[PDB]
Amino acid sequence: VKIYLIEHVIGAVAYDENGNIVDYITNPRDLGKITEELLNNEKGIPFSATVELLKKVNPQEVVVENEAEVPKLQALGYRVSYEPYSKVSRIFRESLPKVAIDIKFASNEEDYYNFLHELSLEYTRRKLRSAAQKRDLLAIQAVRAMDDIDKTINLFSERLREWYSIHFPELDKLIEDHEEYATIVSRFGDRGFLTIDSLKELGFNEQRINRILDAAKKSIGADISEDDLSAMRMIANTILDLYNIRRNLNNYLEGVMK
Amino acid sequence: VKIYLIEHVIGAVAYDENGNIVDYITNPRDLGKITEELLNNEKGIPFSATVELLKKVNPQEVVVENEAEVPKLQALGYRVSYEPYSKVSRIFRESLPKVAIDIKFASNEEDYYNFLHELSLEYTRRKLRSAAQKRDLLAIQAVRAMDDIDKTINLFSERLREWYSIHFPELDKLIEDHEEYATIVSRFGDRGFLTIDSLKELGFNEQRINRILDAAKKSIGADISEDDLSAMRMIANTILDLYNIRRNLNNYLEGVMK
Amino acid sequence: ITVKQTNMENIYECEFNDGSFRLCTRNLVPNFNVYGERLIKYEGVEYREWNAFRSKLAGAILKGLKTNPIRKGTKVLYLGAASGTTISHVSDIIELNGKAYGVEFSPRVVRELLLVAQRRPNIFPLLADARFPQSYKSVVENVDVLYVDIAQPDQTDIAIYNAKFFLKVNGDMLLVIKKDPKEIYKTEVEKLENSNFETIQIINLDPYDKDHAIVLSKYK
Amino acid sequence: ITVKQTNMENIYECEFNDGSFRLCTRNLVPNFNVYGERLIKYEGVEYREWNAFRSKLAGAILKGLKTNPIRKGTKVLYLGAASGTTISHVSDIIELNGKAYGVEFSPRVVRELLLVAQRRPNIFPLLADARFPQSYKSVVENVDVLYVDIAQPDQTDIAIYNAKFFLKVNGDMLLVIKKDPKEIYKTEVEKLENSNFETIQIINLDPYDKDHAIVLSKYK
Numbered sequence: 001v002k003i004y005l006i007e008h009v010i011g012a013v014a015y016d017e018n019g020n021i022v023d024y025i026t027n028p029r030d031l032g033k034i035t036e037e038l039l040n041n042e043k044g045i046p047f048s049a050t051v052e053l054l055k056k057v058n059p060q061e062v063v064v065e066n067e068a069e070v071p072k073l074q075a076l077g078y079r080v081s082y083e084p085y086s087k088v089s090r091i092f093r094e095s096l097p098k099v100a101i102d103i104k105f106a107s108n109e110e111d112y113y114n115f116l117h118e119l120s121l122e123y124t125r126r127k128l129r130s131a132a133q134k135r136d137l138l139a140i141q142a143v144r145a146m147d148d149i150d151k152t153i154n155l156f157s158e159r160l161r162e163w164y165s166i167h168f169p170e171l172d173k174l175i176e177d178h179e180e181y182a183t184i185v186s187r188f189g190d191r192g193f194l195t196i197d198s199l200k201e202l203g204f205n206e207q208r209i210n211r212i213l214d215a216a217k218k219s220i221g222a223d224i225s226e227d228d229l230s231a232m233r234m235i236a237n238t239i240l241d242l243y244n245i246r247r248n249l250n251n252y253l254e255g256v257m258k
Numbered sequence: 259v260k261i262y263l264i265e266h267v268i269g270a271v272a273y274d275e276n277g278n279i280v281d282y283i284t285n286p287r288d289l290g291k292i293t294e295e296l297l298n299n300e301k302g303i304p305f306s307a308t309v310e311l312l313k314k315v316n317p318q319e320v321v322v323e324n325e326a327e328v329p330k331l332q333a334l335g336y337r338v339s340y341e342p343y344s345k346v347s348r349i350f351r352e353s354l355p356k357v358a359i360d361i362k363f364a365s366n367e368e369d370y371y372n373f374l375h376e377l378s379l380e381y382t383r384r385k386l387r388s389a390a391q392k393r394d395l396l397a398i399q400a401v402r403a404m405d406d407i408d409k410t411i412n413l414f415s416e417r418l419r420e421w422y423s424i425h426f427p428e429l430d431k432l433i434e435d436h437e438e439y440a441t442i443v444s445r446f447g448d449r450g451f452l453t454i455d456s457l458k459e460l461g462f463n464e465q466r467i468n469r470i471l472d473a474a475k476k477s478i479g480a481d482i483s484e485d486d487l488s489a490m491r492m493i494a495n496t497i498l499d500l501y502n503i504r505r506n507l508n509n510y511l512e513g514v515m516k
Numbered sequence: 517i518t519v520k521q522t523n524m525e526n527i528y529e530c531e532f533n534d535g536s537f538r539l540c541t542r543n544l545v546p547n548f549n550v551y552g553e554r555l556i557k558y559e560g561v562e563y564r565e566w567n568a569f570r571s572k573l574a575g576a577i578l579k580g581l582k583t584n585p586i587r588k589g590t591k592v593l594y595l596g597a598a599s600g601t602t603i604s605h606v607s608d609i610i611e612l613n614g615k616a617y618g619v620e621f622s623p624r625v626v627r628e629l630l631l632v633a634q635r636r637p638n639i640f641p642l643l644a645d646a647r648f649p650q651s652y653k654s655v656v657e658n659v660d661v662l663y664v665d666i667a668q669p670d671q672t673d674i675a676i677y678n679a680k681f682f683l684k685v686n687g688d689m690l691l692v693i694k695k696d697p698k699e700i701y702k703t704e705v706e707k708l709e710n711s712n713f714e715t716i717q718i719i720n721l722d723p724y725d726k727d728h729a730i731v732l733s734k735y736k
Numbered sequence: 737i738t739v740k741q742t743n744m745e746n747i748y749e750c751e752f753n754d755g756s757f758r759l760c761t762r763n764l765v766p767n768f769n770v771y772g773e774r775l776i777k778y779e780g781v782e783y784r785e786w787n788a789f790r791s792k793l794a795g796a797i798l799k800g801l802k803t804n805p806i807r808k809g810t811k812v813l814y815l816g817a818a819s820g821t822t823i824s825h826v827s828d829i830i831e832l833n834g835k836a837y838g839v840e841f842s843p844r845v846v847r848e849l850l851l852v853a854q855r856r857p858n859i860f861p862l863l864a865d866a867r868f869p870q871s872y873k874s875v876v877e878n879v880d881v882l883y884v885d886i887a888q889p890d891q892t893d894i895a896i897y898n899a900k901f902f903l904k905v906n907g908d909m910l911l912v913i914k915k916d917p918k919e920i921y922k923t924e925v926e927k928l929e930n931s932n933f934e935t936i937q938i939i940n941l942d943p944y945d946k947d948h949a950i951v952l953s954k955y956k
C-alpha cells in the first residue's frame with residue numbers, strides 16, 4: 001500500500017501510484033488557518049489534516065513532495081520517501097479546479113478561485129511582514145556593530161597614542177583624527193622616517209607637514225627597536241582594519257535599509 | 259678662524275686645523291655633572307663648558323664631532339659644520355692621558371684613570387636604569403593593550419552571538435569559546451554547510467558534532483542571504499584577528515620582560 | 517486614432533495622429549491605471565497602451581514573435597513578476613477565465629505587485645524564490661505557459677526544474693536570456709533545453725531591450 | 737701540575753695530572769672568580785684557566801694565531817664585551833697599565849659586565865650601540881687594538897667605521913665573522929677591508945667554535 005501524499009490549499013489527499021484518490025481530509029475554509037499551515041509546511045511540518053489522514057489510512061509507504069517533511073514523518077512511525085516532481089502530483093494539479101469541488105472544499109469554480117485569490121493576498125502579506133521584520137532585525141545588528149566598532153576605535157587609538165608617545169609624544173596633539181594617527185604609525189614607524197614626500201601621501205599641506213617634521217627633529221621621546229614598533233603596529237593596523245570594516249557595514253546598511 | 263670642537267670627559271677644547279689647542283674650559287671633577295652632561299650631548303646638547311668656550315673664542319667656523327649638535331649651535335649664531343672622524347679629533351685622542359694633565363683636569367695619569375673608571379661605572383649605571391625604565395614602560399603598554407583586546411573580544415563576540423542567532427540561535431549555548439564560535443561563522447557561514455567532516459577541523463568529538471548537526475537540522479532560525487552572512491563575517495574575522503594579535507603580544511611581552 | 521486586431525488574440529494596435537503605431541491590450545479594469553501607461557478610448561472600449569521599452573513581451577511581438585502562446589483563458593506561471601508591468605498585460609489577454617500565478621523574490625518589488633493583483637482577480641501573487649517550486653506547489657496548479665524573466669546566471673535549469681513540476685505536456689515556455697548565423701549563437705541554452713524541450717523561436721530584443729533575448733519552446 | 741710561558745706575552749699553559757693542556761692567564765685579582773673558571777696555584781702565583789670553548793680568542797690561539805696583538809700595556813676597544821668572559825682575560829694580559837674599553841648593547845648582559853669591571857680597574861664598561869661610535873667618543877681614547885665580536889650581518893663596515901675613529905695607524909683589528917683554498921673563501925670581507933686594511937691571518941675556529949672565524953688585520 002504505497003501512497004502519494006498531496007498537500008494543497010484544498011487539504012490533504014491520499015493517492016495511489018496510478019493517481020486515484022484513496023482518502024482525503026479537506027481543509028477548513030479559513031484564511032488564517034490555511035495561511036499559517038502553509039508556512040510551517042515550508043519548513044516541513046505536516047498539515048494537521050495530514051496527521052488525521054495518515055491515521056485512518058496508515059499506508060505501508062508514503063511518498064511526499066517536500067524532503068523536509070521526510071524526517072518529521074519518520075518521527076511518527078511512517079516509512080517515508082521523497083519524489084520531487086512525480087506523475088501523481090502532476091495528475092493532481094491537472095485536475096485542480098474540479099477536485100476542489102469533488103472533495104467539497106469549494107461549491108463551484110468561481111468560489112474556489114475567489115478563495116484562492118483571497119488566500120494568496122493574505123499569504124504574501126504575511127511573508128512580507130516577516131521578511132521586513134527579519135531584514136531590519138539584521139539592520140539594527142549592523143547598526144549596533146558600528147557602535148561597537150566606534151567605541152573600540154576610541155579605545156585602541158587612545159592606547160596607541162599613549163604607547164607611541166613614549167617614542168614621539170609631540171604627535172598626539174598634532175593629529176586629531178584617529179585614522180590619520182594610526183596611518184602614520186602603521187606606515188612610517190620611526191619618527192625618523194618621516195619626510196616631506198611621505199606626509200603628502202596623507203594630503204597634509206605645508207604648515208601641517210613642517211610642524212610635524214619640526215616636532216620629530218626636536219622630539220623629546222625615546223629610541224625604540226624594530227620589535228617595539230612592530231608590536232605597536234599590531235594595534236595601529238587593527239584600527240585601520242576597523243575603519244575599513246565600519247565603511248563596509250555602512251554600505252551593507254544602506255543597501256538593505258533601502 | 260676655523261675651529262674644531264672637541265668635547266670629552268675632560269672638558270671643552272678648541273683646536274685649530276693642525277691640532278694645536280687655541281683655548282680650553284675644563285670640566286669640574288664631579289661624577290654627576292659629567293655623567294648628565296654626556297647624556298644630553300648624545301642628543302646633541304652642547305656642554306655648558308662648550309657654551310662658555312665658544313664665547314671667549316667665538317670663531318669664524320666651528321666643526322663638530324656629532325651632527326645633532328649642528329642645528330643646536332646654529333641657534334646660537336655660529337657657522338657650524340660636521341666632520342665625522344677628523345684627523346684633529348684623532349690627534350686629541352692620541353694625546354689623551356697627557357692633555358688631561360696639561361689642561362689641569364687631572365694631577366697625573368693614575369688619577370685621570372681612577373676618575374675615568376669611576377665615571378664609566380656611573381654613566382653605564384645611569385643608562386641601565388633608564389633602559390630598564392623605558393623597556394618596562396613599553397611592557398605595561400603591551401599588557402594594557404592585551405586587556406583592551408580581551409574586553410574587545412568579549413564585546414564583538416557578544417555582538418556576533420546575538421547577530422548570528424537570527425540564523426542559528428541554537429549554537430550560542432553549544433559553543434562556550436569565543437574563538438571556536440567565531441571560527442564556525444567565519445569558516446562555514448550557513449548552518450546548512452555544517453558537515454561531520456568540517457567540524458572535525460576544529461577537533462570536536464562525536465558527541466559535540468552530532469549535537470551541533472542535530473541543532474542545525476531542527477533549527478528555528480531564519481534563512482539569510484550571502485550579503486547578510488558576509489557582514490556578520492566581518493565581525494567574526496575581526497575576532498579571529500584579535501586572538502591572533504593577542505598571542506603575538508604575549509610573545510613580545512615574554513621576550514622583553516625576560 | 518484607431519484600434520486594430522493583430523495576428524494574436526486580445527492583442528491590438530493603435531494608429532495615432534502623429535503617424536506611429538503602439539501595441540495595446542483591452543483593459544480588464546476600466547478607468548484604472550497600472551504603471552503610468554496611457555488609457556485610450558475607441559468605440560466604447562478602453563485599452564491600455566503596451567510600452568515595448570518597458571515590457572520584454574511587447575518587445576518580442578514587434579520583433580516578430582510568430583505565434584504567441586498567451587491567449588484567452590491561458591493558465592500561466594510567471595517567474596519574475598516584478599512590480600506588475602507585464603503580467604498586468606497578460607491578465608488583459610488571459611481575461612477572467614485564464615489565471616496568472618506571479619512569483620517574485622524581492623519584498624520591495626512584491627509590495628507593488630500586491631496593488632496590481634488586488635484589483636485583478638486573475639492575478640495570484642507569491643513572495644517566493646523560483647529556485648524552490650516546492651514552496652508554492654501547495655498553491656499553484658498546472659499551467660499552459662511558463663514565462664520566465666529572472667536576472668540569474670542559471671535561468672535555464674531553474675526554468676526546467678519549474679517546467680517538470682508545473683508545465684502541461686505540450687505546453688510552452690518563454691525564457692529571457694542574457695548576426696549571420698541562426699542559433700549557433702545560443703547553443704549552450706538551445707542544447708540544454710533540447711535534453712527535454714523543443715525550440716520554436718529565438719528572438720533578439722534590440723533596440724527595445726539591448727541586453728536580453730527570448731526563447732520560445734515546447735515541452736515534449 | 738705545571739705552568740709554562742707560551743709564545744705570547746702573559747699567556748701561559750697548564751700541564752695536568754690527566755695529560756691535557758689548558759690555556760691560562762695570570763690573575764689580576766687573586767682569589768676572585770669571574771665566570772666559574774678554575775683557579776690554579778703554581779709557585780706562589782694564581783692563574784685563571786682560559787676555556788677555549790667559551791672564549792673565541794683562546795680558540796684562535798690553539799688554532800694557531802701566529803702573532804697576538806694583545807700584550808702587556810695594550811690599549812683595546814672591545815666591541816661585544818658581553819658578560820665579561822673574554823675581556824677579563826685581556827685585562828689579565830693587558831695588566832694595569834693597559835686599558836680595555838668594553839662596549840655592549842644589551843642591558844641584561846651589561847649588568848653582569850659591571851660586576852667584572854668593578855673589581856678590575858683597567859676595564860671601562862659602556863652601554864652603547866657599536867653602530868654609533870659618536871656616543872662613546874667623549875669617553876674612550878685611541879687604541880692599539882680593535883676587538884670586534886657582534887652577531888650582526890654587517891660586522892665589517894661597523895668595525896671599519898670604529899677603526900677610523902679610534903684605531904691608531906699601524907694598529908691591529910680582530911674581527912669575528914660568520915677547505916683546499918686559502919682565503920678565496922672569505923673574499924667578500926677580505927676585500928672590503930682591503931679598501932683600507934691589510935689582512936695578516938684568517939683563522940677557522942673549529943672544533944672550539946663551529947660557526948665563526950677570525951680575521952687579524954692591520955690598519956694602514
Ligand SMILES: C[S@@+](CC[C@H](N)C(=O)[O-])C[C@H]1O[C@@H](n2cnc3c(N)ncnc32)[C@H](O)[C@@H]1O
Nearest residue numbers: 596597598601602620621622645646665666667
Ligand atoms: C528582469 S526583472 C523582471 C521584470 C518582469 N518581466 C516584469 O514584469 O516587468 C527580474 C526580477 O526577478 C526578480 N528575481 C530575482 N531572483 C528571483 C528568484 N530567484 N525568484 C523569483 N524572482 C526573482 C528580481 O527581484 C527582479 O525584480
Ligand SMILES: C[S@@+](CC[C@H](N)C(=O)[O-])C[C@H]1O[C@@H](n2cnc3c(N)ncnc32)[C@H](O)[C@@H]1O
Nearest residue numbers: 816817818821822840841842865866885886887
Ligand atoms: C658573539 S657575542 C660576544 C661574546 C664576547 N666575545 C665575550 O666576551 O664573550 C655578541 C654580543 O654582542 C652584543 N651586541 C649585539 N649588537 C651590538 C651592538 N650593536 N653594539 C654592541 N654590542 C652588540 C650582544 O648583546 C651579544 O652579547
